[PDB]
Amino acid sequence: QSKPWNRYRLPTTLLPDSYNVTLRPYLTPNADGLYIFKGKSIVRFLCQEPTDVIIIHSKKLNYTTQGHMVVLRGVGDSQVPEIDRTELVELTEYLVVHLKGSLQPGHMYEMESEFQGELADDLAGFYRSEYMEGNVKKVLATTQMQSTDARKSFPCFDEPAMKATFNITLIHPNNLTALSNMPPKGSSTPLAEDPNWSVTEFETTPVMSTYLLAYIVSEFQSVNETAQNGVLIRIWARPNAIAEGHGMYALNVTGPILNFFANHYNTSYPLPKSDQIALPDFNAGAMENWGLVTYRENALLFDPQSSSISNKERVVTVIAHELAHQWFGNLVTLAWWNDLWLNEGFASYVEYLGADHAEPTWNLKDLIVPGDVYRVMAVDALASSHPLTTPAEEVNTPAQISEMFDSISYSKGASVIRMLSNFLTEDLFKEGLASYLHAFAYQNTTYLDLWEHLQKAVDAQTSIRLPDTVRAIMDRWTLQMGFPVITVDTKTGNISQKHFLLDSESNVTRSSAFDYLWIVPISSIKNGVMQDHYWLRDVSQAQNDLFKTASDDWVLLNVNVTGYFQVNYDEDNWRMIQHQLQTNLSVIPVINRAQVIYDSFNLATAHMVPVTLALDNTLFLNGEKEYMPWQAALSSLSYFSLMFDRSEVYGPMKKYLRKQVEPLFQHFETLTKNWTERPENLMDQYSEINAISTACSNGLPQCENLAKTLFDQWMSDPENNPIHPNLRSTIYCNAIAQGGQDQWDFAWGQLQQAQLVNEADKLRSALACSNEVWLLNRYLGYTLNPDLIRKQDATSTINSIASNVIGQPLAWDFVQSNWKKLFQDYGGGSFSFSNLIQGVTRRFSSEFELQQLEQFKKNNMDVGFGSGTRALEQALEKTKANIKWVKENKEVVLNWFIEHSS
Ligand SMILES: *[C@@H]1O[C@H](CO)[C@@H](O[C@@H]2O[C@H](CO)[C@@H](O[C@@H]3O[C@H](CO)[C@@H](O)[C@H](O)[C@H]3NC(C)=O)[C@H](O)[C@H]2NC(C)=O)[C@H](O)[C@H]1NC(C)=O
Ligand SMILES: *[C@@H]1O[C@H](CO)[C@@H](O[C@@H]2O[C@H](CO)[C@@H](O[C@@H]3O[C@H](CO)[C@@H](O)[C@H](O)[C@H]3NC(C)=O)[C@H](O)[C@H]2NC(C)=O)[C@H](O)[C@H]1NC(C)=O
Ligand SMILES: *[C@@H]1O[C@H](CO)[C@@H](O[C@@H]2O[C@H](CO)[C@@H](O[C@@H]3O[C@H](CO)[C@@H](O)[C@H](O)[C@H]3NC(C)=O)[C@H](O)[C@H]2NC(C)=O)[C@H](O)[C@H]1NC(C)=O
């Protein structure tokens, strides 16, 4: 029998009731350069089953407790056994307390410890974050427990189902503010031992998981609102950020979002207050700590003067995402990390709903389709994908837990939950969701519990009828990887499903309990009129007259792409859809206008339609005003540009795209009143952004003229930038491309003096658009200078230069030559050799370029490749796939573009 302290999962013999935790960060280094924090904790736990060992999580903590590493007491009049010894077991991250007798069922115990750890700049546990305010380097103390780092801050039963209440106290410099999950109990009091420090106690948390604790000590300030029901809302940030008003947008949307969710969930916001804090360089992006949500600055803050509308959209949706969790995930918590997909999937879906409430004119709900659905299908249409579900007993180690946090969990999770709500109807979905939240509040669940409560709601009504149980249906979508292509022969109405793979030669080796058959909800529209809903059962082939069509009629499946699948038709039906989009595109919903483009390019990749059919599906775009279908085209074609932009194919490609986008350019020229005023709603603003991007990058002279005029205007008056933030990336890029060292040097100056990261990013990126070899090389020569280019930006800047057809060889030459610099920067901060390699080799599509990559590899005899080792193999493999794709497609594609470019 194995010793329990060598098992990764905690015993269930002991369960925590409540913790006191007092943490004291020292924000002044100890002069060997070391920052520490000190802590003291008491955990009260209950014995469920007799045991003579206490096993609790501890990670990178030194114990200074008097006697053993802990002191153990009985609660009330319980006796306690004597401690034999305490030991730390590093591998399974345990503090192990061996006793001289057994704890007794039903008795409670208190275990007290004193400890310290490094306050490292490592974004894990209780950690430090360094940033600049004017001349001074500032340091704050903050937390990130997700997933298994609570134990790095204090000893705890660090699994999500083992919930307890927490009484947090912070000891901090008396001029800093302390924040935690809950409000402070009252005013801070001086630390008696040293009144330069103050003590801030917080109110007891609800019963909650350790991974959701947070506590922060900083100089931060806030903007505030008190909601109608007394809930205090604050946005926290650097003093200078607050004074500039950068917190206002987040404050604006937070109250409406909380309101939306309380109603959506049929459950009151379960806390007295809501803090959200913008942290500089918080690399984890955001974290849903209950009552104190952390964000990277650029995710939470918004500067109206310099920020694009896409920035605004990022803020409202990330807020909606994190706040969603304040019920789903935090109030009701998934019992184990194998079900992370339900938590993160759910939030990734409802973030659109919450944000839509905040910005109801923006049509934000549509964006899940490009943003999650088609995004994740790119990776879920591979043989190397994996099911949403993982057996709980395969997920044990902190590394295994971290692997749960991927595209499949978030984006496919979101996609399938969205499908589920749609086929249930939202009213029904909300009923079951409410039922589930009420039943399990302050406890833990599996995804089976949600299905069960949804089934209850289905069973409690007569209007929605399903072909099987909620569980049986969702099993198809959760227990096996991938999704089907649904193919329709409209001559007969025969409809079929098969597991969709982009690589039609791929072998799937992952077996499925269902033989890769799904139970598929299929909506359809015929001649622009909604049809009865249909379910495809778990069969390869079926027939329904719903999908049978006359010779003039057309049918289209999966309205708004609510279903997690792609659709193919016979060629005749494709043509009728094409004629429709040619003649009155309004008849087909805008999302489906995009779908036709998305699906057909994937189908073409998979050899299920010819590539010319996918291209034909772009022909209608010359009359398309809306964002999504154009985005579908541009996303699908970016690979074509990547493969062909050094080839004879490019001329006709540019020409075709100029033809298509010109009318849209003209449309916006008039609509915007000579570009003086942006379109009102988000989608049209996005469409304008892309139309100007597409026009300019494909050499529409009108756009080229506009870019030069605005950049000239800016250069004559540097303090008054005349370019609207929406348009900056294109206008900067195109204008530097047309210009020489005057435009480049000016933008360089602007970059050096930029105070905002997103404006800096745009400049850095546009600078790569120069058409002068000497400028691009000189620029490369800067990328390794941390005085001129931030290290964290070096590989990014190199990639942007690689992106320039002219900068391709220069960047490639630069990376090969300075490869001897992994052994400066696999020790001096990561880099991402991996993302650098992929970017610079992305274009490679010939035998000759492969012979080059192979020759570059023969620097194996030392330095190696670091964190980018594996991505070098991927480059070699991707190049082979590129060589084969270009040989298959070059002739067909060239002659299509020639034929259609006038
Ligand atoms: C976890 O932390 C809690 C908060 O500090 C502890 O509860 C507090 O204990 C204090 C002292 O033990 C009590 O404060 C005062 O102490 C004097 C001692 O001179 C007592 O007479 C009084 O009971 C008390 N004064 C008042 C006005 O109540 C607090 O009562 C008490 N705070 C509470 C209950 O909210 C917990 O004991 C601690 N848990 C463990 C297991 O140690
Ligand atoms: C938790 O305890 C650890 C083990 O006791 C500490 O790790 C040790 O830190 C020591 C002091 O910081 C290091 O010892 C030496 O430090 C002196 C001056 O401080 C130097 O002369 C030496 O260069 C250095 N020793 C060596 C061998 O280079 C130890 O390196 C180190 N020991 C281990 C086993 O890691 C932690 O610092 C302590 N952490 C906290 C937060 O309290
Ligand atoms: C948080 O919400 C606030 C209230 O809704 C917004 O405050 C609004 O800012 C708008 C943009 O600055 C102002 O609109 C126009 O501002 C120009 C300034 O020169 C004026 O010409 C217009 O008269 C004015 N619009 C109208 C309709 O009068 C609003 O004045 C102002 N609204 C209110 C109620 O104060 C914030 O913009 C918003 N913060 C963010 C970052 O979105």
Ligand SMILES: *[C@@H]1O[C@H](CO)[C@@H](O[C@@H]2O[C@H](CO)[C@@H](O)[C@H](O)[C@H]2NC(C)=O)[C@H](O)[C@H]1NC(C)=O
């Ligand atoms: C954290 O603080 C809370 C609130 O003061 C403590 O809750 C008290 O628990 C004691 C003994 O368990 C009860 O007699 C009181 O009724 C509780 N008060 C409330 C309002 O619930 C809790 O015990 C503290 N946790 C620890 C570990 O000491």
Ligand SMILES: *[C@@H]1O[C@H](CO)[C@@H](O[C@@H]2O[C@H](CO)[C@@H](O)[C@H](O)[C@H]2NC(C)=O)[C@H](O)[C@H]1NC(C)=O
């Ligand atoms: C909190 O108090 C400390 C010490 O009085 C201040 O920290 C000093 O700030 C000055 C700039 O005014 C720096 O030159 C010193 O090096 C800082 N000392 C340390 C140890 O960092 C701090 O500015 C005060 N903060 C607030 C918000 O009042």
Ligand SMILES: *[C@@H]1O[C@H](CO)[C@@H](O[C@@H]2O[C@H](CO)[C@@H](O)[C@H](O)[C@H]2NC(C)=O)[C@H](O)[C@H]1NC(C)=O
């Ligand atoms: C949760 O939903 C319930 C049930 O739909 C809400 O209760 C209804 O509230 C309306 C408000 O006018 C009443 O007319 C209905 O009669 C109520 N129905 C029942 C069964 O009580 C309830 O308000 C919601 N609760 C929260 C906290 O959001």
Ligand SMILES: *[C@@H]1O[C@H](CO)[C@@H](O[C@@H]2O[C@H](CO)[C@@H](O)[C@H](O)[C@H]2NC(C)=O)[C@H](O)[C@H]1NC(C)=O
């Ligand atoms: C994990 O959640 C389950 C519920 O899904 C908790 O079990 C419930 O506990 C409450 C309060 O003791 C009881 O009223 C219910 O009868 C229980 N339901 C069950 C056992 O199915 C369970 O306590 C949680 N696990 C931990 C370790 O806290």
Ligand SMILES: *[C@@H]1O[C@H](CO)[C@@H](O[C@@H]2O[C@H](CO)[C@@H](O)[C@H](O)[C@H]2NC(C)=O)[C@H](O)[C@H]1NC(C)=O
């Ligand atoms: C549509 O599906 C039907 C089957 O449901 C196919 O018709 C069958 O084809 C086989 C060919 O060997 C015949 O032996 C069966 O008797 C046919 N069943 C009939 C006519 O009811 C038909 O080929 C399919 N058409 C397609 C996919 O275009």
Ligand SMILES: *[C@@H]1O[C@H](CO)[C@@H](O[C@@H]2O[C@H](CO)[C@@H](O)[C@H](O)[C@H]2NC(C)=O)[C@H](O)[C@H]1NC(C)=O
């Ligand atoms: C397909 O999605 C579109 C949005 O792209 C939906 O259109 C919205 O419909 C709701 C209610 O019908 C309106 O409140 C919105 O104003 C509509 N927006 C637009 C831009 O039309 C449409 O309802 C969806 N279709 C189906 C069948 O679900």
Ligand SMILES: *[C@@H]1O[C@H](CO)[C@@H](O)[C@H](O)[C@H]1NC(C)=O
């Ligand atoms: C998969 O197996 C078949 C052998 O029948 C082969 O066509 C193919 O080359 C194998 N591997 C891949 C990646 O296609």
Ligand SMILES: *[C@@H]1O[C@H](CO)[C@@H](O)[C@H](O)[C@H]1NC(C)=O
């Ligand atoms: C195109 O169809 C839309 C909606 O289906 C309709 O309202 C409009 O009249 C049609 N336009 C023309 C020119 O027929």
Ligand SMILES: N[C@@H](CC(=O)O)C(=O)O
């Ligand atoms: N739970 C977090 C993960 C993290 O903080 O990295 C998110 O999905 O934003």
Ligand SMILES: [Zn+2]
């Ligand atoms: Zn999340």
